[PDB]
Amino acid sequence: PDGQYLLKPCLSHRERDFYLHIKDDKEWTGTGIIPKFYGVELHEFGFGELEFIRVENLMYKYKRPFVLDLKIGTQTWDPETASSKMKKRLVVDSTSTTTSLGVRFSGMERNIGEEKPILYSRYLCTHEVNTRDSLKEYIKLFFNDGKKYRKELVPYFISQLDKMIEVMKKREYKMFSSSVLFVYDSTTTLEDKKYNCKMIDFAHNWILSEEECTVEDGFLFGLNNLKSILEDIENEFKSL
Ligand SMILES: Nc1ncnc2c1ncn2[C@@H]1O[C@H](COP(=O)(O)OP(=O)(O)OP(=O)(O)O)[C@@H](O)[C@H]1O
Ligand SMILES: [Mg+2]
Ligand SMILES: [Mg+2]
């Protein structure tokens, strides 16, 4: 997981089409809110070729990665979701913070030099991270590198969410089961700039200029609540 690139297969048209749709939009590609997109590529697979997207690896050259995946939206199903998955989708949405906050914990990795990374399962979302207060604490734990709280990194993450909110108010796209990914290298300085905050996983993105999506995603609602939590974390790290 330590190369320049992520070569992600195109298992459906939606992620590929979204990247192609915004590829000349400076609001998407010049703001640093999504991974850098290199293009769609065909690579040999089976009897023919398989379509891939090539994007930057956000953790390139990270020494001790810290990773936090936050799933955004008031629901994680869309009009194309298979019926066999629907009961589980409805339960997890309602018993996590998804329906209430539009954002929920979806996994964490912390490397504190303890000879093995500490993995926090995404299934913690319906039991241990099922409240706003518990979600705030786990994000605080993400900013804990094992020795201190990296309070200086928080303003970057709020700034990233601000740019995300600005583009999503235009409501040109609906996104389901997408995430905002928090990463940083604990060995970094503010000048090394080895930290990042990006939207990812657009496999269920709808292009509203080309198709209808009746249900709402609650994506802007989730982004605002996540920004509010980080602002609370900023105010609470002042006592350090
Ligand atoms: N550009 C990136 N650079 C580095 N890591 C990434 C990047 N995009 C995603 N990741 C990480 O790598 C793994 C990425 O998955 P993706 O977002 O690719 O999942 P999926 O394959 O679409 O599966 P699912 O829908 O079940 O989450 C995730 O766990 C995410 O943390
Ligand atoms: Mg995902
Ligand atoms: Mg996906």
Q: Which protein residue's CA is at the shortest distance from atom 11 of ligand 1?
A: 181
In 3D, which of 151, 69, 70 has the Cα closest to residue 109?
Answer: 69
Ligand 1 atom with minimal separation from the 181 CA: 31
Task: Flag whether 120 is in a domain.
Answer: yes
Domain count across the chain: 1
Cα gap 47→33, rounded to integer Å: 37
Residue 226 CB–ligand 1 contact under 6 Å:
no
Task: Flag whether 193 is in a domain.
Answer: yes
Provide the CA 87 distance to its chain's centre, in angstroms: 24
Technique employed here was X-ray
Cα of 238 vs centre of ligand 2, distance in Å, is 33
Structural domain boundaries enclosing 123: 62-239
Tokens of 82: 């298979």
Identify which ligand lies nearest to the alpha carbon of 34: 1
Task: Flag whether 52 is in a domain.
Answer: no
Task: Flag whether 157 is in a domain.
Answer: yes
Say if residues 33 and 163 touch (Cβ distance below 8 Å): yes
Task: Flag whether 210 is in a domain.
Answer: yes
In 3D, which of 216, 139, 204 has the Cα closest to residue 176?
Answer: 204
Task: Flag whether 229 is in a domain.
Answer: yes
Cα of 192 vs centre of ligand 3, distance in Å, is 30
DSSP conformation letters of the chain: --SSEEEEE-SSHHHHHHHHHTTT-HHHHTTTSS--EEEEEEEEETTEEEEEEEEE-TTTT-SSEEEEEEEESS-S--TT--GGGHHHHHHHHHHSSHHHHSEEEEEEEE--SSSS-EEE-GGGGGTTS-SHHHHHHHHHHHTB-SSSB-GGGHHHHHHHHHHHHHHHTT--EEESS-EEEEEEETT--TTTT-EEEEEE--TTEEETTTS---S---HHHHHHHHHHHHHHHHHHGGG-
Cα gap 104→77, rounded to integer Å: 14
Q: β-pairing, 205-207 with 173-175?
A: antiparallel
Task: Flag whether 18 is in a domain.
Answer: no
Task: Flag whether 99 is in a domain.
Answer: yes
CATH number at residue 127: 3.30.470.160
50 — alpha (psi -120 to 50), left (phi > 0) or beta? beta
